Amino acid sequence: MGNIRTSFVKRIAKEMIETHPGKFTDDFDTNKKLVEEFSTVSTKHLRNKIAGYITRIISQQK
């Protein structure tokens, strides 16, 4: 096996979301704008995974 390496991405997500408590609106558009109003992640297509990640956390949270 090797290293896991994924928790750091989760930390970036936290930093991005937690800067604005507009959380748990369980909509893709909401999380989209939530990401775009902050955005601290490199790689433009990686933003997609971030937006989906938020939505995923939210849907499982409820």
From Swiss-Prot:
SUPFAM superfamilies noted in UniProt: Rps17e-like
UniProt-listed GO biological process terms: translation
Pfam family, one: Ribosomal_S17e
GO cellular component: cytosol; ribonucleoprotein complex; ribosome
InterPro entries: Ribosomal_eS17, Ribosomal_eS17_CS, Ribosomal_eS17_sf
Record GO terms (molecular function): structural constituent of ribosome
Keywords: Ribonucleoprotein, Ribosomal protein
Family under the similarity heading: Belongs to the eukaryotic ribosomal protein eS17 family.
Name of the protein in its database record: Small ribosomal subunit protein eS17
Organism of provenance: Methanothermobacter thermautotrophicus (strain ATCC 29096 / DSM 1053 / JCM 10044 / NBRC 100330 / Delta H) (Methanobacterium thermoautotrophicum)
